Design a binder for this molecule. Structure first.
Ligand SMILES: [Ca+2]
Ligand SMILES: [Ca+2]
Ligand SMILES: [Ca+2]
Ligand SMILES: [Ca+2]
Ligand SMILES: [Ca+2]
Ligand SMILES: [Ca+2]
Ligand SMILES: [Ca+2]
Length: 157
C-alpha cells in the first residue's frame, strides 16, 4: 500500500485510467480482482503457457493482502514494475547500439576520430573543442579511447 501510493505517483491520471480499462477487461467476472484462472486466460491468449504455480507466483509478487488475487491497486504496482523493467531494457539496448555505431572499426573503444565521424555523418557540425571536451569527460584513464565501461559511465544522466 505505501508501495501502491508509490506506484500511482509514477503515473498520470490518464495512464491509471487506461490501466483501469485493461484491468476490467482481464477481470472476466467483473468482481473487482483478477484470479489465477483469469490471469491464465489472458496469458494463454498472449501465446504463453504458464503453469498454475507460475500464475500463482505472478500474483504473489504483488498480492500484499494475501487474497490470492490481484486487485486494481496491486495491478498498478505490477504495471509500474513492468514499465520500469522495460525502460531499463530499452536504455540498455540504446546504449549498446550507440556504442556499436560509434565503434566503427569494432576494436572495442571509441577514439576522437570516430566520435567526429559519427557526428558529421549524422549531419551535425561539431567543433574540435567539443570533441576534446567529450574525450576529456568520457576517457577516465586518459589513453585517448573510450571503452565500453567509460561509455556507459559517460552516458549516465
Ligand atoms: Ca475477477
Ligand atoms: Ca490481493
Ligand atoms: Ca574503435
Ligand atoms: Ca585510433
Ligand atoms: Ca547544429
Ligand atoms: Ca554544432
Ligand atoms: Ca580510456
Amino acid at each position: 500500500t505505501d508501495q501502491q501510493a508509490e506506484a500511482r505517483s509514477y503515473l498520470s491520471e490518464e495512464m491509471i485510467a487506461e490501466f483501469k480499462a485493461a484491468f476490467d477487461m482481464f477481470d472476466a467476472d467483473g468482481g473487482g480482482d483478477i484470479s489465477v484462472k483469469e490471469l491464465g486466460t489472458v496469458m494463454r491468449m498472449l501465446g504463453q503457457t504458464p503453469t498454475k504455480e507460475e500464475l500463482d507466483a505472478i500474483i504473489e509478487e504483488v498480492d500484499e493482502d494475501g487474497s490470492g488475487t490481484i486487485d486494481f491497486e496491486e495491478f498498478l504496482v505490477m504495471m509500474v514494475r513492468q514499465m520500469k523493467e522495460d525502460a531499463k531494457g530499452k536504455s540498455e539496448e540504446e546504449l549498446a547500439e550507440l556504442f556499436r555505431i560509434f565503434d566503427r572499426n569494432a576494436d572495442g573503444y571509441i577514439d576522437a576520430e570516430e566520435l567526429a565521424e559519427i557526428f558529421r555523418a549524422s549531419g551535425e557540425h561539431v567543433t574540435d573543442e567539443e570533441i576534446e571536451s567529450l574525450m576529456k569527460d568520457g576517457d577516465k584513464n586518459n589513453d585517448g579511447r573510450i571503452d565500453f565501461d567509460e561509455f556507459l559511465k559517460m552516458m549516465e544522466g
